[PDB]
């Protein structure tokens, strides 16, 4: 009843197994993964996002030096000069000709943009993978569960109970350091807090939106006004956030290999097709029945109608059946060759009926399982010329 | 003359739709722009706007324009019609709904009237270039140069060669004859017009009327508030709805028919000419990027051509079966040699 | 519900400035602009103008201007508004010393209203562009999509 | 004002904000199909950048943009190919 | 090239493999936006041989 298994990891594939119960009629199994997703721990480092140089009002004494003060305020850059003779539109502003100096003093303040557009410094962990899985074996044909991977916590959803994983591959697509961008996601390493050179990635770093102070290296420096006109004069590099916006590679989510796609979430990996999957499940005993009401199909023979070597169950065959009573009779083939799509076939005293499946043999020699009945159909397939299928459900490659 | 094609100027009236970018967002203008024509050569456009430019009411006033403002219009002076694009046009005709103009080359197209308290523009995206007649690929119609067969749309508007579709418009809603009778729903009616009539509740149900009331809804957000109105007829446009009764004729003329004229084209300034054994080295100061070609005239014909742009200095190797070469628009030029 | 601003309104007045590129030269014209936010992408810039326009002189009239001529504050309409670019832009909406307006790229940026005699206007070098959200490298917002 | 910095702490009157724009969309390009290999005959009207990647082991991405009309081509593996033309969702594919 | 191929310029009948395919209409908008292949005319008329 406990029957373990070891299943490939697909999103769109079954795994129509058959429980081979002693003293009972055996029972199919119909695994299917709705979701894979990863959701790796993660730490957020900083966000940087462009700045904005608020420069108050300049301090313009008219006759006299005034010494400036080293102000807390990020990235403060403050300079006198001196021998300036500012107008105005009422004027020249001072009588003195040499004692006016201007204080002007500049610093860095994130831009009101960076509420809403802002970059994302991420440092991952291993984590902890998920998954929705859908069975609907035996009769109940329904199950809605989401699961873990560990290889501890148990799944008892509606009557059947069972443990999934630990994963194969300990393969992430996210690397160390993980930076995202309102959407999408870019594998970028960003360098550290508070290291940022200017005009590259990080120019202003932030510890978080909150956050009031910030590390500001923008090569912020001021220098004197020209002709004698009251303004203030600041060179800086350009914003190191507006670079690497129209020059960034691709994002991560059209980069991950095995068909894996993100989402401004947790960060889960979803249908991250890689390795498989140890599966254990504990069946319970009330959908078994007494093997002596199963009907006797013996004596039955199996003729191929018309198989195509292709991905699609292209596949179809008619059985000889040679039964006693009427009832229900899971069909399954144990052997990977083949894989049937059909899952229950009522049987009728001394009936025929077709079934369809899928095969990547020139010349399939598959057995096939009948309620306790085995039968080797074999026969020959054909390659299709027009490949267009969904996406293969055979997945059975291998040498032919 | 100007009024032998009332075929448009009566029996067409203008109608409003959807502009894409109407002053600032999507609104509803009057003027919305229809079927750019960018495919002359000279940089002329035709465009086809949801406004009836040229005659008054009846059959004067070409310097006057009419629009629709709500369910009535109300024709006046085309004291300040612009189209404009990444620099400002200049207009040349305007007739029916359709306006001819010269533009710089551009990316977007707009288009506006000015009623004088308000601006009341349209505009769409849809790029406009300039395509140089000719090899020449210049930017502007020079003042002088050699004439080429060019193909451009004509000014005249007396002409027959195409005509388009003005069926019955469909219905229109106007929510403002949806006032209230105390306590009821209460539709009025433009002249006798048919207003298509109905509510979610069960109540009065096609609308074929005077001035009716209605007996069971209240909200003027859940009645049908229409206007059958093809006492006038309406061009075939994508952006109105099309009443399923039928759909009329009256296909009326194009105004302005392309037509294949001769525009003035640049001529590139002539090369200096330099030689050496079985060697023409040509010297070559273009202003604008024009094409130079060359051919022999021996069996192999051996072409070779290329836009040059940058003054260059090339040279050509000159079999005693000759050589010809066509720089620009200039006539084509042969030589022999020793 | 616009009159809940009256701390824009009322506690601020109008202010004139170094403008770089007032007209011919560098004057001192009352609609100095500074910092032209033209961060978006469907091409609207915000620009704040050292006019402050919004209501008038008391708390009325949202269709007017109030700029500073001379030692006083003159409050008239804003008839003749400009913003332009390598193209003309087209005004959305303004309040206090900010106008709200989305225009072409382009590599300078005027403002200019007009008082009836005078040009008035203003300008400054600052680089504008727009690419659309999307991998559409547009130029314009379309019609559908 | 050597004085002081009075109060009048003033609000930003136009905040960005995070809305939804229309944004412009690609023809769809003419699918072409070969033996193991993917045709994708296209005529971009504005430059668009298309980026393919492979659902193997091995990614194989490949990001460009193209402005004129132009053929490319892209060999379909029995893992399977995906594809992003323009803003269009993204599209997979099979092999044989 | 040839995407429109008319028998004559008078020709009623013609042919005309251009991919277009209609789309939804955006924001309940009364419009017909239609998603069109660029002019194949066009092209090679930028990019003709010699
Ligand atoms: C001197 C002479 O023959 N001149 C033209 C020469 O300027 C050019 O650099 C070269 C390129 O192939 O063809 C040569
Ligand atoms: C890079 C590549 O394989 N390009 C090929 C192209 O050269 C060929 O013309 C076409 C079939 O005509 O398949 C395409």
Same mark, same amino acid.
């Given at each position: 009843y ?20 002693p003293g ?10 709705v ?58 502003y ?10 002007s ?19 991952v ?10 069975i609907t ?9 989401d699961?873990?991977?560990?290889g501890? @916590?148990?799944?008892k ?13 300990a393969?992430s697509?996210?690397?160390?350091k ?22 590259s990635?990080?120019?202003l770093?932030?510890?978080?939106? @909150?956050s ?10 001021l ?6 006109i ?7 590099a350009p ?5 690497w ?13 095995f ?7 947790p960060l ?8 498989s ?26 003729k191929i ?12 065959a ?10 229900n ?8 060759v ?9 049987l ?7 079934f ?9 020699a ?19 010329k027009?490949?267009i299928?969904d ?10 | ?6 075929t ?11 502009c ?5 967002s ?37 310097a ?20 404009r ?46 395509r ?14 050699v004439?080429?067969?060019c193909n451009?749309?004509?000014?005249k ?14 219905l ?23 207003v298509?009539?109905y ?9 074929i ?35 399923e ?7 009326l ?7 294949k ?31 130079l ?11 070779t051509?290329?836009?040059?742009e ?8 000159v079999?005693g ?11 084509p ?6």
């Amino acid at each position: 009843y406990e029957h373990t298994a070891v299943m490939p990891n697909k999103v769109g594939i079954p795994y129509k197994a058959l429980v081979e119960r002693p003293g009972y009629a055996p029972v199919h199994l119909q695994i299917q993964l709705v979701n894979t997703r990863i959701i790796p721990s993660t730490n957020l480092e900083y966000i940087t996002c462009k700045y904005k140089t608020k420069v108050p009002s300049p301090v313009v004494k008219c006759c006299g030096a005034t010494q400036c003060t080293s102000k807390p305020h990020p990235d403060y850059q403050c300079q006198v000069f001196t021998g300036v003779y500012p107008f105005m539109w009422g004027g020249a502003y001072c009588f003195c000709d040499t004692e006016n100096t201007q204080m002007s003093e500049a610093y860095v303040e994130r831009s009101e943009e960076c509420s809403i557009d802002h970059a994302k410094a991420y440092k991952v962990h291993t984590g902890t993978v998920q998954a929705m899985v859908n069975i609907t074996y035996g009769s109940v044909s329904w199950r809605s569960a989401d699961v873990y991977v560990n290889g501890e @916590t148990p799944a008892k959803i509606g009557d059947a109970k069972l443990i999934i994983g630990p994963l194969s591959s300990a393969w992430s697509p996210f690397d160390n350091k993980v930076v995202v961008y309102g959407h999408e996601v870019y594998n970028y390493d960003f360098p550290e807090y508070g290291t940022g050179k200017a005009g590259s990635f990080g120019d202003l770093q932030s510890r978080t939106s @909150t956050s009031n102070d910030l590390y500001a290296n923008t090569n912020l420096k001021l220098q004197r006004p020209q002709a004698g006109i009251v303004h203030t004069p600041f060179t800086q590099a350009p914003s190191g956030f507006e670079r690497w916006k129209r020059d960034k590679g691709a994002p991560l989510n059209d980069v991950a290999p095995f068909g894996c796609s993100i989402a401004l979430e947790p960060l889960r990996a979803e249908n991250c097709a890689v390795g498989s999957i140890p599966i254990s499940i504990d069946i319970p005993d009330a959908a078994f029945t007494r093997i002596s009401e199963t009907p006797t199909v013996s004596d039955l023979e199996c003729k191929i109608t018309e198989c195509t070597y292709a991905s699609d169950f292209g596949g179809i065959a008619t059985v000889a059946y040679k039964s006693s009573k009427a009832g229900n009779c899971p069909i399954h083939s144990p052997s990977g060759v083949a894989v049937i799509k059909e899952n229950d076939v009522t049987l009728a005293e001394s009936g025929s009926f077709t079934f369809h499946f899928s095969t990547a043999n020139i010349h399939p020699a598959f057995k096939l399982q009948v309620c306790t009945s085995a039968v080797t159909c074999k026969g020959d397939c054909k390659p299709p010329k027009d490949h267009i299928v969904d996406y293969p459900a055979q997945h059975t490659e291998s040498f032919t | 003359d100007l009024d032998t094609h009332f075929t448009q100027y009566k029996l067409a009236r203008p109608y409003i739709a959807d502009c894409p970018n109407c002053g600032h967002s999507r609104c509803d203008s009057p003027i919305a722009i229809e079927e750019v024509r960018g495919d002359a050569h000279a940089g002329v456009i035709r465009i086809q706007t949801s406004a009836m430019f040229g005659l008054k009411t009846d059959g004067v006033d070409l310097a006057y324009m009419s629009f629709m403002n709500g369910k009535t219009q109300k024709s006046i002076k085309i004291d300040n019609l612009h189209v404009r694009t990444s620099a400002p046009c200049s207009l040349v005709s305007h007739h029916g709904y359709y306006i001819l103009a010269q533009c710089p080359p551009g990316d977007t197209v707009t288009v506006g009237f000015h009623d004088g308290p308000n601006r009341h523009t349209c505009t769409v995206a849809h790029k406009v270039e300039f395509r140089p007649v000719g090899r020449e690929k210049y930017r502007h119609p020079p003042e002088h140069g050699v004439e080429l067969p060019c193909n451009r749309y004509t000014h005249k508007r007396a002409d027959q060669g195409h005509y388009v579709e003005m069926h019955q418009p469909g219905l229109v809603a106007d929510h403002s004859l949806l006032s209230i009778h105390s306590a009821k729903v209460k539709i009025t009616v433009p002249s006798g017009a048919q207003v298509k009539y109905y509510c979610k509740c069960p109540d009065v149900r096609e609308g074929i009327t005077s001035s009716d009331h209605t007996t069971t809804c209240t909200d003027v957000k859940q009645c049908r508030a229409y206007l059958i109105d093809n006492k006038k007829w309406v061009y075939n446009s994508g952006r109105l709805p099309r009443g399923e009764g039928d759909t009329f004729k009256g296909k009326l003329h194009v105004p302005f028919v392309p037509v294949k004229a001769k525009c003035i084209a640049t001529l590139a300034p002539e090369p200096l000419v330099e030689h050496k054994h079985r060697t023409l080295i040509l010297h070559l100061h273009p202003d604008h990027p024009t094409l130079l070609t060359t051919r022999s005239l021996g069996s192999d014909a051996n072409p070779t051509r290329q836009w040059i742009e940058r003054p260059t200095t090339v040279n050509f190797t000159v079999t005693g079966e000759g050589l010809e070469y066509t720089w620009g628009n200039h006539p084509p030029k042969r030589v022999w040699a020793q």
